[PDB]
Structure 1
């Protein structure tokens, strides 16, 4: 009965867009937003870790979301990741995001220290209470956060009526299946590991949020079309092509998001700036990998679209 159709489809993570001085670029943010509208994705996931949120200030993240919403509002579903190291910064971003009329806010767990489940629930509920009219997505990423969304913690969080589901970036597709089986029809699970897109989708994730989607959004849209059509052979071919490109982008000395920003300059003429330190920048030796990955994306689009 709760309507979650606006979340069903391909929702790329929005990248950090910087100017030449390394500050957030309003023009760069608007340009990348126009790119996502033109590519016909379902939505954008803004100021996630793929958007370098770990490395941004509250003010940086407000400027990014304001500039996304100037272009995207009414055209894309917008999920704003608002978690910060502390609760008060997270509440400030939640209130700001509700003020702009985002569809949902999201939060990773507390990081660095491994906090008990009651403290994790308190953090998410405090963030949710700052945006009390806004859908809330839990982002499960135990490999990086150091704590997991357990089945017991998910039961506790489903007591909050704003919680709509889970963006799952743990590696077991079993976790998707268990969260969806426990929660039932009024919740959505998003597939987080792009390399497993087709496998998380078939086992019950009806949404998909990914850090590599922005490099090749047409391929993930075509993958999703094949899955919805039961064309599993064609879906596998596209998944394998996407994964080969991911492995190529991850083979660079510079960070994978540095590779993606360079690819989008080659393939689209988009200027997204550098990646923020401490993420490592590309070196000269990486430009052959960038060029190869960019061409692999063009070749896969020609093969599959």
Structure 2
């Protein structure tokens, strides 16, 4: 299994565009997907956290997945977010996404209900048992309120269909050892730690700021891969203001406001997420100009 070829190296956790009435806008979704791949992404995650998976319906997730596969599926990998805090629901979503032709699944730690580690294991195993797709665990305790503990990640690595981890936990030392011991592929799921994750052996990024700076993140991956760490560091510093704006706004608000500033209107977030205020737009524009992604 060639993870870089099968899932990608630079993915955006793409926003889900909404029309002015809040409804799903698949035409803009196809335009945005083409834009992000043209800028350097070789894969996309649809209905990740940044895609507002909490506020879209099953039917909207499937419509979006279909539109993005049609738009870019012949030249980029399209990974479907399919996990929730409900194992039966997650299985239904995984099967539906496989039926549409998703290239892989991203499955987040069940949030809010804080299952024990053996419940996390049974959950992820049940989802991995539901389809033949390659599956990435998505470890984000800062959102889900429980981590996937290292012993649990290691147990899940023995599943033939679980191929890697999108990490937003930042235990770089543990991830390095898991990668060495199990061959799971790691993706950085926190843009601030993209470069440290590459140092520890990560395959690539599942990025939020790639909405705005995909070309530079592609240059960073290439520079690092060729051993030119000084250039990778310089690019990382160049895009650092975008990580700073992400910390202020969150990925959903940042991505929808930033794309608008770049001339790609993707609508507003759905409640309880909120659109950036005029003052926040002004501060975001300043960071984007500093990062050379806005005139």
Partner of 1:289: 283
- Report SS of the residue matched to 2:281: helix
- Report SS of the residue matched to 1:80: strand
What CA distance in whole angstroms lies between the structure 1 residues aligned with 2:138 and 2:245? Answer: 26
Q: How many residues align?
A: 294
Partner of 1:266: 261
What CA distance in whole angstroms lies between the structure 2 residues aligned with 1:235 and 1:207? Answer: 13
Alignment of 1:50-89 (within 5 A): 50-89=50-89
Query: Taking structure 2 as the reference length, what is the TM-score of the superposition?
Result: 0.93
Partner of 1:257: 252
Partner of 1:158: 157
Structure 2, unaligned runs of 5 or more = none
Q: Which runs of 4+ in 1 moved over 4 A?
A: none
* Aligned equivalent of 2:224, options 218, 223, 227: 227
Partner of 1:145: 144
What CA distance in whole angstroms lies between the structure 1 residues aligned with 2:95 and 2:67? Answer: 17
* Aligned equivalent of 1:217, options 201, 205, 214: 214
Partner of 1:111: 111
Partner of 2:244: 247
Does the 8 Å contact 2:120/2:148 carry over to 1? Answer: no
- Report SS of the residue matched to 1:189: strand
What CA distance in whole angstroms lies between the structure 2 residues aligned with 1:164 and 1:151? Answer: 15
Does the 8 Å contact 1:249/1:293 carry over to 2? Answer: no
Does the 8 Å contact 1:4/1:188 carry over to 2? Answer: yes
Partner of 1:127: 127
What CA distance in whole angstroms lies between the structure 2 residues aligned with 1:50 and 1:247? Answer: 17
Structure 1, unaligned runs of 5 or more = none
Relative distance call for 1:220 and 1:142 in structure 2 (3 A) is: same
What CA distance in whole angstroms lies between the structure 2 residues aligned with 1:65 and 1:11? Answer: 15
What CA distance in whole angstroms lies between the structure 1 residues aligned with 2:89 and 2:81? Answer: 12
What CA distance in whole angstroms lies between the structure 1 residues aligned with 2:23 and 2:10? Answer: 28
Relative distance call for 1:275 and 1:176 in structure 2 (3 A) is: same
Relative distance call for 1:84 and 1:214 in structure 2 (3 A) is: same
Shift of 1:301: 8.8
Shift of 1:296: 2.6
Q: Deviations over 1:208-242 (max 9, x none)?
A: 11122111101100111110111111111111121
What CA distance in whole angstroms lies between the structure 1 residues aligned with 2:25 and 2:69? Answer: 14
What CA distance in whole angstroms lies between the structure 1 residues aligned with 2:92 and 2:219? Answer: 37
- Report SS of the residue matched to 2:50: helix
Does the 8 Å contact 2:65/2:80 carry over to 1? Answer: yes
Relative distance call for 1:205 and 1:15 in structure 2 (3 A) is: same
What CA distance in whole angstroms lies between the structure 2 residues aligned with 1:193 and 1:287? Answer: 22
Does the 8 Å contact 2:134/2:162 carry over to 1? Answer: yes
Shift of 1:300: 6.2
